[PDB]
Design a protein around this motif. Structure first.
Motif, PDB file in Angstrom:
ATOM      1  N   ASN A  39      41.817  90.760 101.128  1.00  0.00           N
ATOM      2  CA  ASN A  39      42.507  89.477 101.282  1.00  0.00           C
ATOM      3  C   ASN A  39      42.898  89.335 102.752  1.00  0.00           C
ATOM      4  OD1 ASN A  39      44.576  87.528 101.569  1.00  0.00           O
ATOM      5  ND2 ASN A  39      45.529  87.981  99.586  1.00  0.00           N
ATOM      6  N   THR A  70      44.465  86.989 104.484  1.00  0.00           N
ATOM      7  CA  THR A  70      45.846  86.589 104.734  1.00  0.00           C
ATOM      8  C   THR A  70      46.789  87.784 104.680  1.00  0.00           C
ATOM      9  OG1 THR A  70      45.392  84.399 103.824  1.00  0.00           O
ATOM     10  CG2 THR A  70      47.695  85.125 103.871  1.00  0.00           C
ATOM     11  N   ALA A  71      46.609  88.662 103.687  1.00  0.00           N
ATOM     12  CA  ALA A  71      47.497  89.813 103.557  1.00  0.00           C
ATOM     13  C   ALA A  71      47.213  90.875 104.624  1.00  0.00           C
ATOM     14  CB  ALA A  71      47.399  90.398 102.140  1.00  0.00           C
ATOM     15  N   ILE A  92      49.249  90.197 107.784  1.00  0.00           N
ATOM     16  CA  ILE A  92      50.620  90.712 107.774  1.00  0.00           C
ATOM     17  C   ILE A  92      50.678  92.078 108.450  1.00  0.00           C
ATOM     18  CG2 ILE A  92      52.637  91.231 106.342  1.00  0.00           C
ATOM     19  CD1 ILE A  92      51.620  89.355 104.219  1.00  0.00           C
ATOM     20  N   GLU A 132      50.906  91.354  95.480  1.00  0.00           N
ATOM     21  CA  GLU A 132      50.360  90.158  96.127  1.00  0.00           C
ATOM     22  C   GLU A 132      49.964  90.412  97.579  1.00  0.00           C
ATOM     23  OE1 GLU A 132      54.513  87.918  97.632  1.00  0.00           O
ATOM     24  OE2 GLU A 132      53.216  86.953  96.135  1.00  0.00           O
ATOM     25  N   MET A 133      50.440  91.498  98.188  1.00  0.00           N
ATOM     26  CA  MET A 133      50.004  91.903  99.518  1.00  0.00           C
ATOM     27  C   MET A 133      48.804  92.849  99.497  1.00  0.00           C
ATOM     28  SD  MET A 133      53.479  92.456 101.845  1.00  0.00           S
ATOM     29  CE  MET A 133      52.420  93.135 103.132  1.00  0.00           C
TER      30      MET A 133
HETATM   31  C1  NAG Z   1      46.513  86.925  99.641  1.00  0.00           C
HETATM   32  O1  NAG Z   1      47.607  87.414 100.407  1.00  0.00           O
HETATM   33  C2  NAG Z   1      48.721  86.522 100.569  1.00  0.00           C
HETATM   34  C3  NAG Z   1      49.762  87.293 101.341  1.00  0.00           C
HETATM   35  O2  NAG Z   1      50.365  88.284 100.518  1.00  0.00           O
HETATM   36  C4  NAG Z   1      49.243  86.054  99.211  1.00  0.00           C
HETATM   37  O3  NAG Z   1      50.254  85.073  99.417  1.00  0.00           O
HETATM   38  C5  NAG Z   1      48.104  85.495  98.369  1.00  0.00           C
HETATM   39  O4  NAG Z   1      48.579  85.165  97.070  1.00  0.00           O
HETATM   40  C6  NAG Z   1      46.999  86.536  98.258  1.00  0.00           C
HETATM   41  N1  NAG Z   1      45.910  86.057  97.427  1.00  0.00           N
HETATM   42  C7  NAG Z   1      45.423  86.770  96.406  1.00  0.00           C
HETATM   43  C8  NAG Z   1      44.295  86.141  95.645  1.00  0.00           C
HETATM   44  O5  NAG Z   1      45.877  87.875  96.109  1.00  0.00           O
END
Ligand code: NAG
Ligand SMILES: *[C@@H]1O[C@H](CO)[C@@H](O[C@@H]2O[C@H](CO)[C@@H](O[C@@H]3O[C@H](CO[C@H]4O[C@H](CO)[C@@H](O)[C@H](O[C@H]5O[C@H](CO)[C@@H](O)[C@H](O)[C@@H]5O)[C@@H]4O)[C@@H](O)[C@H](O[C@H]4O[C@H](CO)[C@@H](O)[C@H](O)[C@@H]4O)[C@@H]3O)[C@H](O)[C@H]2NC(C)=O)[C@H](O)[C@H]1NC(C)=O
Ligand SMILES: *[C@@H]1O[C@H](CO)[C@@H](O[C@@H]2O[C@H](CO)[C@@H](O[C@@H]3O[C@H](CO[C@H]4O[C@H](CO)[C@@H](O)[C@H](O[C@H]5O[C@H](CO)[C@@H](O)[C@H](O)[C@@H]5O)[C@@H]4O)[C@@H](O)[C@H](O[C@H]4O[C@H](CO)[C@@H](O)[C@H](O)[C@@H]4O)[C@@H]3O)[C@H](O)[C@H]2NC(C)=O)[C@H](O)[C@H]1NC(C)=O
Ligand code: FAD
Ligand code: FAD
Ligand code: NAG
Ligand code: NAG
Ligand code: NAG
Ligand code: NAG
Ligand code: NAG
Ligand code: NAG
Ligand code: NAG
Ligand code: NAG
Ligand code: NAG
Ligand code: NAG
Lengths: 581, 581
Positions: A386, A388-389, A392, A525-526
């Protein structure tokens, strides 16, 4: 003695029940095994692929024999994929036996920067995981010895407020009884000419400058491997059992409830020749950062895109095996004048600017503009899932470098007849993976890819830190002792610029064997695999307790942190046990 | 099934008495075990470090999956010393399971030159060891199938007079069901333009030119590994027993006033955890050329200069571990046009003059003038103990080249979507060694040094044969299919001369895994370790029966020879059995 106590026949444990099964009798596994069995009512079975080695002789017990054990049955010698940077296979040294990699490591004992551990609670949402709490566990594990006059005169400094003296892991100055080489104080003087600090206690929370350090050994210089320190004083406990010579293959899971429960493991040595044992409370995975994720994957806990082509059913989908972070190590070596003779080790913990020198501006510019692109490229290579993560993580590293000025590279000096630097960039931005390649755990067929040098800042920083190691060897007081370079020597012109070092370094490096992050401790989620109590998301009674879980690298050697991390986890396991009584 | 019949608990075996103990369930071990137990009164115990692997699936049973098993538990992956030619450690692939390296090899089935086998009797004084005898044993072992019309159209030629069709090892053409690539006949056309022969049957005793060959597989393409061929048909024999998962540590020797006798072996997994078993007749070592010499050393059989510093009393003083001979392998690879698609393997067996090209006169001048100097230099490096005895080997090699014109290098072609050559000099003059580094067999701490490229003709020859593979890849009818070189590619200029190739080759090669010689079958006064019945000099009831004993390399793949060698030794062992009844 202890040898007679070890179990070797699988049939003497098969089909029985214990409270806790610990897969892997290494550093974290043996620490937790000892803490748990302090309560005589709690039963623990440790299952370890190797056996007892602490009494073997100097090849284990003398830290100065470092590396002679490589290639033997005490070294797993895991093989990487064919690395993209140089089209070569690399070897991952890893201890095989009771004590794990503490049987085979360099014995160096230092701590990271306060802000690095603090980020585990501020960035990675782990309640209670910060410098103060981890350092308090560190000191509680520690049994350090202050240096004497001889050792202080060589270059040691010891701030007693940063060390426990009542704990379990014996630590003090390495001393071969020889005289200490003056080259250590010569390197200190050479960096003081540049405004770089010297003799900071690398245990206090700001590892920066050139210093000496304690070692994990007893005063008589016997290596303080985790089995000697945590198992040998306790093996007579009837509630502590140790099965040697067997591999844990997979976690046994309940089919029952809403969410699966770990109820035991399968262990053995070959397909068709394996056995079960039941855990009443929990299964704790401690097989090392290269292995514990594979155990999860063989058990159906991992990425469906990985397990399905192998014919393994996915029961809990998690990004197991991603986010692998290991460092790259290179060497600069020089002969010394007769005046340089003597024992002694030291290290320069160098900042980003100290590492890059003239290239500081251009490197800062890359760090300031390329993070998003770098994250996309690592995700495309399968090192993380991911983008986006991952960003971080990169934003966190930039703050470490730009706002906190943590050490960015380590220049490790050995003397004892020469001037030799092992050099590594401490904060790689590359991310790799480890994944199984077959459904049979005992085939041990897997792809381990740290993706060394596939991030351009990692290659620039490694080249710059190694060039600096050549520079400082013939600079200042170090000129007194310089007697000609032997590595790189002929292989790289002595006046090479940074571009020339960049061309050379991929063909002259080894893994650092500091791999972390394959079951990262951060929110799901990270991209995390375990919570702040090391529990695997979506499974009851199952933890990963070893070097798989640190979500970041750190500007230090890891034993001070891993001993602390094991004790912290043991308190959480015991707290959940107590709540059931 | 065979799986249930295998023994996996060491305590089921400990303390028994059997007639023969075979250390190593590999190619030669399993052949001799099968031969001996044809007599229902003779009991054999095979002890094998691995286990049964022939039913695992394609990773074993599909020859086209070659290489994926590397790095798994079915691969010993012995690490060399840090090599002098390039300051790297290399990995020796070696099969770990019932069948040994027949489980992991390329399956190629060819025979050497008649004069090379004749030299074992003529030069190395081994009565009965000549082409006529060894070939007859080879044909008896062999169960070949003639190629059909599709396979002949691709380039196969098969002379029925050179092949057994009623033996044990299934052999015939690899055939994946695809069309055969036209690139094979193109390569034949390209060497035909230079007067090089084609389509000779490489089983007939004059292996020269470009030919196709049989493979060790059944008609439905299942790998004919030694366990599938020699053990699976026979595992129900009550007098045949097989212990898996255990290493033989050392030979048990009587210690009294008379000559030492092999009375059993000690086996196990770790220094705390081993057992004995008694041999009434003989102990036979078949653990591979890298291992059987170390088993002797651990038992006090070997060089005093090696054993004594390790604390091992020298019981029999022999040059065990010397004379190690392995070849070096490099790659040239290119893309192909759409018209080149299809399956197919071939090999160019190239004479001395064919490999060296325009350097032929200079190469011949080296070979004519430097033999004594080279033998002095190999002995000074520890690859052999007696300079004159080594010079005898070198003269034999010069005769093979100048008087017999045997193949000197092999250029092995793979197609199936590309054009890829693996290239090796077949006759290295370098001599290496393997020696133990510790007295504990189960630590497996040893120094294995093939000394690649430390003889200058070996480096020159490998450079020239690899340049030849680049040359012929874009010559004559091959030009039709050439679509750009990928290896070396950017790593070496396409018009590089021999000097440039010589610079590049040390950093672009791998072991061939054909190592022989470490217990050489030749007279004691020539440096040998075993007589012409494979008995160790100075010991009663002990033989070495594997790839340790061939005193030379050969211009072929060795399976045709090793099956015959094992059958011939079995006859000698059985003749001594009949003498005691
Ligand atoms: C990807 O990472 C971001 C940051 O933690 C999070 O907000 C988002 O939900 C993540 N997406 C998935 C599919 O896990
Ligand atoms: C693999 O790795 C090894 C090292 O780990 C490499 O071997 C070393 O190579 C370097 C060159 O790159 C050598 O350094 C040179 O040293 C000579 C003078 O050294 C002589 O004197 C020493 C004491 O006074 C003595 O110990 C040495 O003896 C050893 O070496 C010889 C031959 O190398 C050997 O035969 C002996 O048995 C010993 O083992 C030696 O005789 C010096 O002339 C060189 O200086 C050049 O460079 C300097 C730059 O600072 C420059 O100022 C000069 O003008 C000059 O041009 C250079 O320092 C080193 O001796 C080698 N050996 C060791 C143990 O380090 C090996 O090359 C690598 N192989 C590869 C890459 O394939
Ligand atoms: C490690 O080892 C690998 C090989 O296993 C090395 O990768 C290969 O490098 C060579 C160059 O040394 C490349 O060959 C060149 O190919 C280009 C054009 O290739 C394009 O077309 C292919 C289809 O025809 C296509 O498959 C290619 O895509 C793959 O490769 C690229 C990288 O090239 C990659 O980005 C893709 O993702 C794919 O993986 C690609 O699109 C061609 O221009 C070159 O021609 C030269 O040679 C000719 C005649 O010989 C000459 O006339 C020209 O002037 C020109 O100089 C050359 O053929 C090869 O594509 C690479 N990949 C392979 C083989 O898979 C890698 O470099 C090594 N790493 C090291 C050493 O660190
Ligand atoms: C060469 C080297 C040098 C080092 N030098 C230093 C240093 O100077 N300073 C420092 O602080 N740290 C150093 N370290 C790091 C430190 O030793 C390790 O990080 C630490 O030992 C890791 O602990 P762990 O519990 O995560 O796993 P490990 O200690 O590696 O233990 C894992 C255990 O599990 C066993 N095992 C593996 N697979 C299985 C299986 N399937 N079933 C059962 N058991 C299994 C292994 O045999 C091993 O005993 C070094 C490491 C290496 C490799
Ligand atoms: C990668 C590779 C490719 C090859 N390709 C070809 C080819 O195309 N054509 C060809 O003709 N030949 C080929 N060969 C060579 C051929 O497969 C071998 O030479 C042959 O298998 C060697 O027979 P051996 O009995 O001497 O040893 P091995 O077959 O290696 O048997 C040794 C056995 O002993 C076991 N063992 C090891 N240590 C111990 C111990 N301490 N105690 C007990 N058991 C032990 C091993 O696990 C193994 O089963 C190849 C070899 C390799 C490695
Ligand atoms: C020693 O450590 C303590 C705790 O970090 C600190 O207060 C003190 O300033 C340090 N330095 C010295 C010289 O005492
Ligand atoms: C062992 O493991 C699994 C449990 O998931 C199962 O196949 C088997 O029934 C278990 N018990 C025994 C005795 O094998
Ligand atoms: C490091 O370099 C940057 C840019 O060259 C500069 O802004 C900064 O102040 C320097 N010093 C430190 C301690 O970061
Ligand atoms: C090393 O770094 C210093 C830093 O100022 C520089 O002056 C010098 O030119 C560099 N190179 C050498 C060979 O000392
Ligand atoms: C086939 O083999 C025999 C025996 O070596 C030989 O006499 C004959 O010439 C070979 N070739 C042909 C075409 O028969
Ligand atoms: C010595 O041992 C051998 C072999 O075990 C035996 O045959 C012989 O009788 C023994 N000799 C003496 C003198 O005991
Ligand atoms: C094994 O052999 C050794 C010495 O050869 C000896 O300790 C013992 O008598 C034998 N048997 C057992 C069970 O150890
Ligand atoms: C090979 O080359 C040499 C000269 O370099 C020559 O004497 C010989 O006749 C050539 N041909 C053969 C088949 O050896
Ligand atoms: C290739 O081989 C032929 C035959 O020796 C030779 O004429 C030619 O010059 C060689 N080189 C190239 C680039 O084709
Ligand atoms: C060396 O080998 C030669 C040739 O076999 C032999 O004549 C001589 O006796 C040997 N020398 C020694 C010391 O073994």
């Amino acid at each position: 003695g202890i040898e007679a106590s070890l179990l070797t026949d699988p049939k003497e444990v098969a089909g029985r029940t214990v409270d806790y099964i610990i897969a892997g009798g290494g550093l974290t596994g043996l620490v937790v095994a000892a803490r748990l069995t302090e309560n005589p009512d709690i039963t623990v079975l440790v299952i370890e692929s190797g056996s007892y080695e602490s009494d073997r002789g100097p090849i284990i017990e003398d830290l100065n024999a470092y590396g002679k054990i490589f290639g033997s049955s005490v070294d797993h010698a895991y093989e990487t994929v064919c690395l993209a940077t140089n089209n070569r296979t690399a070897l991952i040294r890893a201890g095989n036996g009771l004590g794990g990699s503490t049987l085979v490591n360099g014995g160096t004992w230092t701590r990271p920067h306060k802000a690095q551990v603090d980020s585990w609670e501020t960035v990675f949402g782990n309640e209670g995981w910060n410098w103060d709490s981890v350092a308090a566990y560190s000191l509680q594990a520690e049994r350090a010895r202050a240096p004497n006059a001889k050792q202080i005169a060589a270059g040691h400094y010891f701030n007693a407020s940063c060390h426990g003296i009542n704990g379990t892991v014996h630590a003090g100055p390495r001393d071969t009884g020889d005289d200490y080489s003056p080259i250590v104080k010569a390197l200190m003087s050479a960096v003081e000419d540049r405004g770089v600090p010297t003799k900071k206690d690398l245990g206090c929370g700001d590892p920066h400058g050139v210093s000496m350090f304690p070692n994990t050994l007893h005063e008589d210089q016997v290596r303080s491997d985790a089995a000697r320190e945590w198992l040998l004083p306790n093996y007579q406990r009837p509630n502590l059992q140790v099965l040697t010579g067997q591999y844990v293959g997979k976690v046994l899971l309940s089919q029952n409830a809403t969410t699966p429960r770990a109820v035991g493991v399968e262990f053995g040595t070959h397909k068709g020749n394996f056995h079960n044992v039941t855990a009443k409370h929990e299964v704790l995975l401690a097989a090392g950062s290269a292995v514990s994720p594979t155990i999860l994957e063989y058990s159906g806990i991992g990425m469906k895109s990985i397990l399905e082509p192998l014919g393994i059913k996915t029961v809990v989908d998690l990004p197991v095996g991603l986010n692998l972070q290991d460092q790259t190590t290179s060497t600069v070596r020089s002969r010394i004048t007769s005046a340089g003779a003597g024992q002694g080790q030291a290290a320069w913990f160098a900042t980003f600017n100290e590492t890059f020198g003239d290239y500081t501006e251009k490197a800062h510019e890359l760090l300031n503009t390329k993070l998003e692109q770098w994250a996309e490229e690592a995700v495309a290579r399968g090192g993380f899932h991911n983008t986006t993560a991952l960003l971080i993580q990169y934003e966190n590293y930039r703050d470490w470098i730009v706002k906190d000025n943590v050490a960015y590279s380590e220049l490790f000096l050995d003397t004892a007849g020469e001037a030799s630097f092992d050099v590594w960039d401490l904060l790689p931005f590359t991310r790799g993976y480890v994944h199984i390649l077959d459904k049979d755990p005992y085939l041990r067929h897997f792809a381990y890819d740290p993706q060394y040098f596939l991030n351009e800042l990692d290659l620039l920083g490694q080249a710059a830190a190694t060039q600096l190691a050549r520079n400082i060897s013939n600079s200042g007081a170090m000129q007194t002792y310089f007697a000609g370079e032997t590595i790189p020597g002929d292989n790289l012109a002595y006046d090479a610029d940074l571009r020339a070092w960049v061309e050379y370094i991929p063909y002259h490096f080894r893994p650092n064997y500091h791999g972390v992050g394959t079951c990262s401790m951060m929110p799901k989620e990270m991209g995390g695999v375990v919570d702040n109590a090391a529990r695997v998301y979506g499974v009851q009674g199952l933890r990963v307790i070893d070097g798989s879980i640190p979500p970041t690298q750190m500007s230090s050697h890891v034993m001070t942190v891993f001993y602390a991390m094991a004790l912290k986890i043991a308190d959480a396991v015991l707290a959940d046990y107590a709540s059931m009584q």
